[PDB]
């Protein structure tokens, strides 16, 4: 076959050029923008090929580590726009470090715990910063961050009694949840609530009454799920919807056939990455929101006894996604990004790596099959498809909280 | 009055009309994490916002302060919530506030808080008279803005403004037939007005979609809409569609057409079609062509479909 120092790539096959956009000689803003991206991506792909010599791809772990380590402590005023999302920054950075198997010093871990405690609201839940009103987004992030740290100190920071009361204070009669008091409603809330409620063992029989049905109403003609009933299928909202249903054990409420066909169609034939909506551009962060749906669908179908499911691969091109992330989404100075030409940020660093991990690791029952493209060191730690934190962290947290009673309920 | 970038802007700590209240610093703890190095102007405004919030001061000065807090970080939902509390407490002119949010959304159209604020104002006023035009302006700048389309669907459904939306949809499809957001709006309008059970409407839609496919054969949105309006009843329930697609295949063997054929065969086999063995063989042949040549990015999906078909219809 091939010597160990050369690894043929899917994106470099001669026939891959046939995957370039065919605009039928009818130009619109959509095709013009798509063609511009493909042109740049082809240039990038070609820079990794030296005729028959194709060096193994490398995840710049050390560069990413230094970028993350610095951000966990300090951020430039360029992040003032995220002053109401500090727990998100904690989660994005800690999860990235977790995926890279970079240890978190005990002192830094305690400091994160203390900071998130300051973000916790007396009414329950966490806000975007100290003194801010609680909101389900930073609440979801804070809980995930605390679970990644996984110490009893971290677990006990969460005021479970008030958290459950807070969730009740956001619950609507139609099954949906507000993101915060007097705030907006969309499927993100159902997932944020289901995620934190299941991890901390505070689910009551009535908490999610009608929620599964509301989420199902969000699935549209495309097969994917929109933010609210009637809206366009979107990768981020679809991940929220399916993940929430998996937690509620109500995945069957959806048409899984149309959902599967929709998400698989979101992988770009030329770029290898995923787009968030049909006819929109590729973006590294959808490596998680979209690809993450495949392990969820695998689990859902496996629970139904689907005799046709693979026992070694997810139903998306795992190699092509790794090729897109490794060749197109890494910032040479550390951090990951949307696509070539875009600047790095902690959000894309988190989700590009999360998607890379999903693409590298397949697991079902007693079957495990890894596909780590490039040098062996590229292998990342696995991530749980529902919560997007390490599976070990999910088990440790759920076990810990299951030892506590549901707040004021039997 | 004065804006954050205005030459005469003065920090709140230097304003005489604010001297009577002490600012409240943000407590990040002794050993801060994800600490943002705020500009002096940013910290100044928020130190005073924290002060009025803590004292729950429902005043005109607090109201004006939120405007600056919003300019500094329009994503701060706490500031927006407090601003709404003030709008009510101070009985502020909501039409004036509508003019304000209009300007703010134009500046930051992908922000969740600004669109929700606008919705609240429309709900309080029960006045949607400016909505369709405003949203149209936002969509003229970004025809796929998710928040804009979502707000548009809410306004139309809540105030029953369906009368001219299909015309709007047709206009945008003419501009960019690949705009998936518009195809979604098309389904939204039809399903909520005439519905798709009216066979005259369904035929009109199938004809229109097929015409769009002929014009731009590789536009996925049209193909997805065609499947979308026929899938619930079952693709196998439309025998003439299969024949028409089979005729265009030799000249338009795109992955979209081939995949649609497999979708039809899947449903046919699910409904005890005649010549079952022949149909299964044809479907498996196409799955292989898709996996190996025409749609290789989805090789695993097509292999799965092939195995699925065999698990359900081999006999």
């Amino acid at each position: 076959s091939s010597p160990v120092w050369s690894e043929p790539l899917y994106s470099l096959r001669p026939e891959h050029a046939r995957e370039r956009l065919q605009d039928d000689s009818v130009e619109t803003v959509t095709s013009i923008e798509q063609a511009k991206v493909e042109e740049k991506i082809q240039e990038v792909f070609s820079s990794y090929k030296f005729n028959h010599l194709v060096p193994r791809l490398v995840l710049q772990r050390e560069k990413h580590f230094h970028y993350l380590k610095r951000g966990l402590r300090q951020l430039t005023d360029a992040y003032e726009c995220l002053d109401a999302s500090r727990p998100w920054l904690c989660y994005w950075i800690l999860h990235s470090l977790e995926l890279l198997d970079e240890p978190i010093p005990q002192i830094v871990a305690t400091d994160v715990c203390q900071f998130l405690e300051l973000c916790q609201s007396p009414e329950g839940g966490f806000g975007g910063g100290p003194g801010q009103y609680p909101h389900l987004a930073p609440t979801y992030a804070a809980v995930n961050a605390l679970c990644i740290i996984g110490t009893e100190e971290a677990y006990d920071i969460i005021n479970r009694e008030k958290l459950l009361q807070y969730l009740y204070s956001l619950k609507q009669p139609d099954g949906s949840f507000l993101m915060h008091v007097g705030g907006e409603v969309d499927v993100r809330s159902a997932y944020c609530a289901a995620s934190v409620a299941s991890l901390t063992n505070i689910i009551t029989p009535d908490l999610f009454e009608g929620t599964a049905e509301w989420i199902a109403r969000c699935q549209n003609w495309e097969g994917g799920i929109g933010g609210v009933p009637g809206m366009e299928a979107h990768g981020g909202y679809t991940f929220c919807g399916l993940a929430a249903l998996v937690i509620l054990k109500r995945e069957r409420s959806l048409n899984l056939k149309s959902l599967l066909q929709w998400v698989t169609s979101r992988q770009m034939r030329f770029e290898g990455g995923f787009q968030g909506r049909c006819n929109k551009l590729v973006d590294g962060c959808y490596s998680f929101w979209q690809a993450g749906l495949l392990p969820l669908l695998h689990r859902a179908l496996h629970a139904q006894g689907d005799p046709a499911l693979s026992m070694s691969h997810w139903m998306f091109h795992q190699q092509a996604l790794q090729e897109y992330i490794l060749m197109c989404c890494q910032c040479p100075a550390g951090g990951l990004l949307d696509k070539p030409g875009k600047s790095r940020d902690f959000y894309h660093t988190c989700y590009c790596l999360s998607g890379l991990s999903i693409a590298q690791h397949f697991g079902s029952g007693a079957m495990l099959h890894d596909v780590v493209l490039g040098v062996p060191e590229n292998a990342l730690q696995p991530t749980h498809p529902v919560y997007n934190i390490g599976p070990d962290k999910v088990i440790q947290a759920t076990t810990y909280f299951l030892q506590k009673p549901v707040p004021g309920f039997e | 009055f004065v804006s954050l970038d205005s030459p005469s802007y003065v920090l709140y700590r230097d304003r005489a009309e604010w001297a009577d209240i002490d600012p409240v610093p943000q407590n990040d703890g002794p050993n801060p994490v994800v600490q943002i190095i705020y500009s002096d102007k940013f910290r100044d405004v928020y130190d005073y916002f924290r002060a009025v919030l803590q004292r729950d001061e429902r005043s005109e000065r607090a109201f004006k302060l939120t405007r600056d807090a919003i300019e500094l970080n329009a994503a701060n939902y706490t500031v927006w919530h407090f601003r709404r509390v003030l709008l009510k407490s101070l009985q502020k002119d909501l039409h004036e506030e509508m003019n304000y949010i209009t300007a703010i959304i134009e500046e930051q159209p992908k922000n969740y808080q600004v669109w929700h604020h606008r919705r609240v104002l429309v709900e309080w006023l029960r006045d949607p008279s400016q909505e369709l035009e405003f949203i149209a302006d936002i969509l003229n700048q970004d025809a796929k803005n998710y928040h804009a389309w979502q707000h548009r669907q809410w306004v139309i459904q809540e105030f029953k403004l369906w009368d001219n939306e299909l015309q709007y949809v047709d206009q945008l499809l003419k501009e960019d037939v690949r705009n998936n957001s518009v195809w979604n709006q098309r389904y939204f309008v039809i399903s909520n007005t005439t519905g798709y059970n009216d066979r005259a409407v369904l035929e009109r839609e199938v004809q229109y979609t097929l015409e769009m496919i002929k014009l731009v054969p590789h536009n996925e949105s049209a193909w997805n809409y065609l499947k979308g309006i026929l899938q619930d009843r079952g693709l196998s329930k439309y025998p003439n569609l299969l024949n028409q697609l089979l005729d265009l295949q030799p000249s338009h063997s795109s992955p979209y057409l081939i995949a649609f054929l497999v979708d039809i065969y899947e449903d046919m086999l699910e409904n005890q079609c005649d010549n079952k063995e022949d149909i299964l063989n044809k479907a498996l042949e196409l799955c292989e062509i898709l996996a190996k040549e025409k749609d290789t990015i989805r090789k695993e999906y097509w292999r799965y479909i092939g195995r699925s078909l065999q698990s359900k219809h081999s006999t």
Binding site: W88, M179, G236, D283, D338, Y347, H348 | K110
Partner: peptide
């Protein structure tokens, strides 16, 4: 890209 904004999540909230």
């Amino acid at each position: 890209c904004v999540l909230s």
